[PDB]
Structures are given as C-alpha cells and as structure tokens.
Amino acid sequence: MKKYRVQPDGRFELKRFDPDDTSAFEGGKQAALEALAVLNRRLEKLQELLYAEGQHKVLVVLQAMDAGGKDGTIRVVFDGVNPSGVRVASFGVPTEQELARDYLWRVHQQVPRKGELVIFNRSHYEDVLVVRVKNLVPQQVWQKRYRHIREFERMLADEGTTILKFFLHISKDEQRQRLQERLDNPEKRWKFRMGDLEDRRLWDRYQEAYEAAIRETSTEYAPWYVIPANKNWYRNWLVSHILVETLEGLAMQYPQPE
Amino acid sequence: MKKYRVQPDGRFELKRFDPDDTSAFEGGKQAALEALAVLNRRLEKLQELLYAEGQHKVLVVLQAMDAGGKDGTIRVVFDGVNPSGVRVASFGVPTEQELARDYLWRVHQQVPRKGELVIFNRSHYEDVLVVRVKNLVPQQVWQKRYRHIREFERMLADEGTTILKFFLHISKDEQRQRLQERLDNPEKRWKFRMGDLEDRRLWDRYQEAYEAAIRETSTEYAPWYVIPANKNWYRNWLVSHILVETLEGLAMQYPQ
Amino acid sequence: MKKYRVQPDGRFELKRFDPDDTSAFEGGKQAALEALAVLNRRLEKLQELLYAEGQHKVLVVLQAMDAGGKDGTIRVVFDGVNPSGVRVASFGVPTEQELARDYLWRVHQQVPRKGELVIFNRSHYEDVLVVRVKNLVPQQVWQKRYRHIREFERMLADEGTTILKFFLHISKDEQRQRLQERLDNPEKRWKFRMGDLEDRRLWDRYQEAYEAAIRETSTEYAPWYVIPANKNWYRNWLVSHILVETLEGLAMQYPQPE
Amino acid sequence: MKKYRVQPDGRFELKRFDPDDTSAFEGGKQAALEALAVLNRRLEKLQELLYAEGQHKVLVVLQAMDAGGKDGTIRVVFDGVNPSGVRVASFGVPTEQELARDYLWRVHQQVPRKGELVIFNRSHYEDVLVVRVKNLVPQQVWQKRYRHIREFERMLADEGTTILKFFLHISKDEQRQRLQERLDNPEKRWKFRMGDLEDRRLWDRYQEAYEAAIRETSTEYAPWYVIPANKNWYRNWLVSHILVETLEGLAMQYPQ
Numbered sequence A, C: 001m002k003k004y005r006v007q008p009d010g011r012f013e014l015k016r017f018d019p020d021d022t023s024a025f026e027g028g029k030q031a032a033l034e035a036l037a038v039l040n041r042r043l044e045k046l047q048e049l050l051y052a053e054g055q056h057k058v059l060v061v062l063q064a065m066d067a068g069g070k071d072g073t074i075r076v077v078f079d080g081v082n083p084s085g086v087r088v089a090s091f092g093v094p095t096e097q098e099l100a101r102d103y104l105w106r107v108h109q110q111v112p113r114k115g116e117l118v119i120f121n122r123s124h125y126e127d128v129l130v131v132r133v134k135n136l137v138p139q140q141v142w143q144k145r146y147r148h149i150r151e152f153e154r155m156l157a158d159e160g161t162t163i164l165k166f167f168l169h170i171s172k173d174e175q176r177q178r179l180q181e182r183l184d185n186p187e188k189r190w191k192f193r194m195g196d197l198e199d200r201r202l203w204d205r206y207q208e209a210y211e212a213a214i215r216e217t218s219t220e221y222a223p224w225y226v227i228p229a230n231k232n233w234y235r236n237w238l239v240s241h242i243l244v245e246t247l248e249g250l251a252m253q254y255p256q257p258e
Numbered sequence B, D: 001m002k003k004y005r006v007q008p009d010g011r012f013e014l015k016r017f018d019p020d021d022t023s024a025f026e027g028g029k030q031a032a033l034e035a036l037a038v039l040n041r042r043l044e045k046l047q048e049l050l051y052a053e054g055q056h057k058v059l060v061v062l063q064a065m066d067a068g069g070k071d072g073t074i075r076v077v078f079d080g081v082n083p084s085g086v087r088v089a090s091f092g093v094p095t096e097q098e099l100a101r102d103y104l105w106r107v108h109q110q111v112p113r114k115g116e117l118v119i120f121n122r123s124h125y126e127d128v129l130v131v132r133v134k135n136l137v138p139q140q141v142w143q144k145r146y147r148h149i150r151e152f153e154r155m156l157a158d159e160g161t162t163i164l165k166f167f168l169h170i171s172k173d174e175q176r177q178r179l180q181e182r183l184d185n186p187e188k189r190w191k192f193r194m195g196d197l198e199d200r201r202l203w204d205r206y207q208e209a210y211e212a213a214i215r216e217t218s219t220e221y222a223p224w225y226v227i228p229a230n231k232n233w234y235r236n237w238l239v240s241h242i243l244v245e246t247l248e249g250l251a252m253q254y255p256q
C-alpha cells in the first residue's frame, strides 16, 4: 500500500518499479483469487454504504499503455458491484466540440456526484501523455498542464472527492504478447486498430511521459499508485486492496433519519 | 411467458395480474436461483456481444410502487454484467432547469447510445403517474402525454432502440411488510422518507394511474410486461428470462 | 399575410411560390426598412415581456438552401434583441457521439426553456433533407421521420412551445449570384465550403425534399411559412411581421407579485 | 483606461473606488452616448470577426449587488451584437444536481467555445459571495475557493480564453433608489423578491466579500475591473471601451 504509493517529493523514478513484482502477496495465483473474492465482497458492501450515505464522491483514474489492463481491471475489480452507484467514463480521441473548449471541460463534466463511484478509463492525463509523445501541442503549452491538473484535483478533493489514480505498469515484452493475443483472439480482434503499432514504436517516449506526469501530479490529496500489471491476478488483487483500504478509511455511516 | 406481455389492444386490466403469481416457473426459490445463474451468464455474454457489435441500443424501463423492487432488480439481474456497457439513469424530483423544458427533455438526454444497455430507474412515465395522482399539471395536460410517449418510443424504436418496459407489480400488503422491514433495518432506514406515508394513502390512485399508463402505452415496438414482484426470486428470474430472450432475438454478431 | 402560411391539408406545391414575390408589401426597400425598424422595436419589447412572464417557450426554425439567408435573418431580425433571452443553436454535420443516438437527441437538447426564444439555424429537418438527398440512411428509415417530427413538435407545442418554421425560398439564379458574391468578398469567403457546389448540382432534389418536408410537417400547432427570400429587405420584413404577430397573439403579461 | 484595472498585488481596497466617479470621460451623458454608439459599432464588427476566425474564446464575467446593473450592461453593451456568437449564462440558486458535484462543475460547463463570446450574469464568484455572507458552507471550505478560482482561471487563460471580469460598483443609496424604482415600475416589479431585502440588510458583509474576492482573484491572466456603476451612461461606456480595446488587441483575422 505505502510501497506502491508515489510520495509527493518529486523524486519518482519508474525504473524503481518492476512490472513482474508480486512482493506484496505471498500465496501465488490460486491464493490471490480467493483473497480477491474476499476484497470484492467488501467492495460491494462499501459501495452500497457510499450510495446510502450519499456524501462522498469516489474517482478511480486508470492509466496504462495499450493492453496495459484498463478494461480487465474494470471487469474483474468491479464485478458484482451495483450499477446504480458505479459508472465508467471513457476518454478517447477528442471531437471538434471537445477541442473547442479547454482540455479539462470534457473531463470535469464526467466527475462523480455525491454517493457515486466513477472510473475514468483514460483521463485528463492523456493531455500530458499522448499530446506530449505525439507533439500535438508544444512543451510551452503541455508543461503548464501539470499545475492545472494538481489544482483541478485539489479543488475536487477539497470539495469532497476521494481521488485514486492507478498506473497499470506493464513491460514492453508483455505489451507485445498481449497485442498479439488480442489479434489472434476472434472475440478480441475488433479492439485492435492500426494506430496501436505507432504507440509501440514510441514506447520509450510514453515511459518518459508517464514518469514526468506521475512525478508532477502525485499529491497527498490525489496520490498515484504504480501497479505491477504484468500478472493480472496480482494487478486485480492490489487495485482491489488499495480501493477497499481507502473506502474503509472514509469511515462511512448509514444515515439515521427521524 | 408471453402471458406477461401486455397486448396493444387497449383492453388491459391490472386485476387480471396477481403479484403472488409464480405459474411461469415450475418449482420454487432454490430451483429459480440456479435457473437465474444460467440466465445471468447468458446476459453477461449477450451484453459483451452488444458492446462489441456496437449497433443496437437497449433501453430497460423499470416502474414500480415504492419498495416494488426497482433497486433489487438492477442489483441482481445485472450482477456481473460489465459496467462499460451498462448504465443506470435515475429519474427523481425534477429540478427548475428540468421543469423549464418539456418533461421529455431530461429523459431523452439519457437514452442509450449504440452498443449500450441503459436502465431507467423510474422514467418519463412518472409524468403520467405521480404527476397525475398529485395533479402537478391538470388532467387536460397529462392526458395528451400518452400519445407523446407512444410517439417518442416509436421514434426511438424506429431509430434502433430495443425497448423493454417492466412494471414490477407488488400488492398493498407486500408494500406494508417491505416498508416496515425498511424502517426496522438500520442499513435500509435511510431509504425511508416521511412522504412515503402520503404515497401509501394514494395506493388506489397510483394503481389506476399504472393501469391507464400500461393500457395506453403498451405497443408492438415498446411492450409493457407486468412482473409479479411479491417474490423477489420470481421477479429476478422472469425479468432475466424476458431480457435474455429479447437480446437472443437480436441475433447480434461479433464484428469481422 | 396569411397567404404564406402552409395549410395542414397536404396539398402544398412549392411552384405556387415565387422567390421574387413582394405582394404583401406595398412599396420597396426604403419603405420596408422603416416598417422593419417599427417591427424590430415591437420585437425587442415582446422578448422582454416573454423573459419577464417566464412561461412561454419560443422556437424559430430557419431552413434554406446554402446562401438562402439564414445568417442574415438572425442578424437583421434579432438586431437589438436582448442576448439574455435570445439563443442561436446551429445544426451541422453530426458527430459520432451524435449519430450514436437517434437523430432527435442532439436537437431536443437545444429546445428553448421557459421565457427563452431559440433560433434553430438548420434543424431536425436536415434529417429529411440532406439525409434524403444523399441517402445517408435508406428511404425506409427517413420516410418514417415525417411522423416522428410531427409528433415531436406536437409534444413541444402541447407542453408550451410556440413553433414558427420559416423556409427562406430563393431561386437557382439567386443562389449563383450569392455564392459568387460570397467567393469574391474577402470577409465572407470563409463561409464558402467546397461542398456548397455539390449541393448546388443537386438543387432539384433539394427542392423536391423541401416540398415533401413542408407538405408532411406543416401543422396547426407547428406551421410552415414560405418566405420569398430573393429580396433580403422583403425577407427581413415578412419574417419580423409573422414573428411579431405570433408573439402579440400570446397576450403575454408582466407578473404582478404580492 | 488602466486606472480601473485591479493590480495583482493583494493590496486592493474598495473604499479607494467612488461609485459616482466619471474621471475617465470628460464630455458628460450626451457626449458619452455618442462615444458608446461608436464603440458598439466596433464591438459588432469585432464579434463578427471572432466568430469567423473561430479560434479565441471570450469570457465576460459580471458581478454586482442586486440592481447593480448586470441586466442593463448586457442589454446596452451587447445591443445589436449578433446572437449567433453571443451567449448569456446566468448563475442562480444551485439545484440538487448542481450541489451534488463541486461548485465549479456547473460553471465550467458554460465556458465559451472557440469563436464564442459568453457573458456570465453572476458566476463561480457567488461561491465566495452569498456562500460566504450567508455561511452556506463553513469558512474552512469557502476560504480554499479563492485558490481554486485563480487556478481554474489560469487554466482557462492558458488554454486560449480572454477573461474580463467586471465588478459593477454601486453605492448603498443608489441600490435603495433602484430597488424602489423597480418596485414602483409595473414592467419591472416582477424583478423584485422578498429575499432582496435581506441582501440589503447584509450590505456591509457583501462589500467585505467583494473586496476579499477581488483582492484574492485579480490576476495578470484574469483581471478585475471596478466599474463605477452609479451613472449607467458611464458604466455602459467604460465596460464597452475595456471590451473593445481587449478584442482589438487580439488582432483577429478573417480565414482564407
């Protein structure tokens, strides 16, 4: 928990994190599935409590390289969690409507309301990742955006939002295996685009981008967690453990009316 | 199971439906939970197909009296179904912005997009239900709304939306038990409001409102299903069966 | 003046309307400008009353061929009218987010609120115009849309919206002059899109589409008005006259609080 | 005029500003109306150019006490300006849907898009004004909001928004005259509410709230302008002048 939490010291180095690391769990895959089922049951109960109390706002931000485990995390971690209090907001290629306003406009629109848990499948961070790597704006523009994000997230947290930002960390070789597996799976072949290859060629620039973004935006109010995502079982257990510990820390109570 | 589908003949009578009816399931609770688990697995797969194909739009409308089982249906029927392709839109007391436009404005906003399944926890029907009962607009205004709804739903269906409307039918005595159980449960005591007593006094007017709404709006394109909701196990199984049968009927295919 | 209102008889013929017709005004450009200034002053007062009363909703729909006078009508007719109670909603090429829902979704979003006057620069009608002409959906799909529109407009009118639908009617030769004038004007060439020429080639199909749309959707609750728009002075006077007469007919009253 | 622009030094004192001040104009009412007509013609042309170029975003924020001249400024300054590129976003009593998210959510939603000029009739500043005065949230919560505003406005400006914030400054006696004139005018009586009288009972607290807000949020990127609004002719001329000078400074060009 404390080991994977990026301290707000601005001394973060992504090389200090191994995507194949599983040191926080002992028993291996079979034991982790059992432990995950226990955390998932607790998560279902915690969400019902969040919805009932209707005061806190929970924002889960998911960021990863293509095939890093974004969709898998949503699927497995939030499995069985009530759709009435859980919402997924995906952020893709901005439209002309979205580009006509500031980059935060489309994002701020999707923020969770009181008693709601919202998952961001990609986020406002894409405006300091893809736009940096592909040079969609000059440094003089995207460099100022780290301060914007820190301050947008401070405002959200001050106004009652609990912000959990997860970087699902995979290796270059793991991305290759997963992209090939997606291509060879007939039920997953539809997810693949030609543009995914150009992001594979820019792997190093994207790693430099994530390191810069995490170093700049992991705060006390909105912390970043580096999740070793090479082994899905560990990724699913660790994301669930961190989320459950956070929600348990809010000390939420059922309202008692008159 | 088509015995629960309200025919578009305008001859619908709610008295012909018993909330304690379980005749479509040959067995009880334990057998129904097993049957529901099979239907839920099929539902998970059909939504996966819906999202992937990305062509059809699925709208599930839930309407019931307070404690009728709307929250329970969402929880149990859509348990395990991917949150990326499933969305819940709740319709409560209209805001000033909402009331400043036509009653369909806030509802049309929330319609499902291609490859999305949207559940309406209460809907545009509230504008011919609570609105009628409490006379929030005169008889002259809300009577014209039946035609508006039929025509809004025709447009949605013609444009590619599969509309399933479920009326979760509970009895007056079942509501009394559930409202008391809600009050005596500390984890459910929050759902209880003082205004729930006034709505209990208006039970008969609300039943008259539902009968009128269902009779007027059950169409070939947007059918109404009366679900006997006194037994949660039966309610959950029947809603899942009707939903799975409908989605299987769309003959959805994974893109090439 | 009731000669331009299309009766809900389904017997409408666009050939019975001459774009160069000026028979409702006993004079020319100079007298019409004076008459328009009187109507514009009345319109300014009528809008202040609409906003104050805060009950009625006013929807002005503008439809015309490219360079038919939609922007000019907004500019001249609503000149001096308070921006607090007047809004323009433009409908262009639908986005992917817009095409993912029914064609009425993006249009219903922009409907006027109580005490507001909204102008639709192009509208839901485009889904039976450019959609019909270029076969963006099959005949089996867009033919059902006349009933959808009639019923959407009935719901709006029943719920308190006053619907004025204006077809700004220009000749094929007038469009040629205006498109050329647009191209030769440096302050107006930004408006000229290359596709305008392709829409000009399809002139006859578009006239057939407008005749069909007007014949099908001109109702007692939402009437269509064919405005001879070849002479801008007449177009501006006639639209202002019809709008002022309609708003005067609402017999709006200033609220009288306790 | 640079004399009315609040320097980002945090040393702003509202007592240094006289609502009856007219020192930037030497001619008087009749001469100012003529000068305003010239500026309004320039404003009409500059908006047509903003819309055509479709790159810049213009945000005009209006803040004043009740009857301070917010509606009058919109009416007179933007008179004849094309409605296609001009939008008014009013911020009133927050709805339940609005209060369920952060106070900036409803505000950020209304920001101008490329080629659009948006006027905020009241704004996000209300969340450090009526919220401060009436203690709708505790001091601990609204004190943090000045930093939020500065940073929200920095982000907007960095992303291409030209932010003009105008405080229409009226005296306590001028408000009394205007509220009475509103009450005695049959065509303006509707604008009067019983709650307007409490905002007069709390005049001093509101002045302390405006001084705090202006001192905390007047920046190089989003400046505050204190407009002596006791004389409408001067208010309309000065707001017009500042706006026209700003828009002329954008050096906007017609696309090729």
Ligand SMILES: Nc1ncnc2c1ncn2[C@@H]1O[C@H](COP(=O)(O)O)[C@@H](O)[C@H]1O
Pocket: A090, A091, A092, A093, A094, A122, A126, A127, A130, A131, A136
């Ligand atoms: N702000 C943005 N600017 C540019 N590209 C973006 C932005 N947000 C998301 N994207 C990209 O849009 C794509 C969406 O892909 P997906 O939603 O996974 O199908 C990803 O490759 C993102 O990197």
Ligand SMILES: Nc1ncnc2c1ncn2[C@@H]1O[C@H](COP(=O)(O)O)[C@@H](O)[C@H]1O
Pocket: B091, B092, B093, B094, B122, B126, B127, B130, B131, B136
């Ligand atoms: N159109 C409407 N007009 C009036 N009340 C409504 C409308 N739609 C929903 N409601 C009511 O809003 C309430 C929502 O309560 P809840 O289920 O606790 O969120 C119920 O009492 C509904 O009947």
Ligand SMILES: Nc1ncnc2c1ncn2[C@@H]1O[C@H](COP(=O)(O)O)[C@@H](O)[C@H]1O
Pocket: C090, C091, C092, C093, C094, C122, C126, C127, C130, C131
């Ligand atoms: N429903 C629609 N389907 C297709 N094209 C449309 C639709 N609505 C508007 N358009 C077109 O979008 C364009 C907008 O151009 P403009 O007037 O320059 O903004 C016109 O060519 C319209 O015909």
Ligand SMILES: Nc1ncnc2c1ncn2[C@@H]1O[C@H](COP(=O)(O)O)[C@@H](O)[C@H]1O
Pocket: D091, D092, D093, D094, D122, D126, D127, D130, D131, D136
């Ligand atoms: N954030 C806010 N919190 C509370 N009241 C507000 C807020 N924003 C605006 N208001 C008030 O809403 C009212 C709107 O008045 P009106 O001009 O009649 O529409 C004013 O009294 C404002 O002070």
Ligand SMILES: [Mg+2]
Pocket: D122
């Ligand atoms: Mg106000």
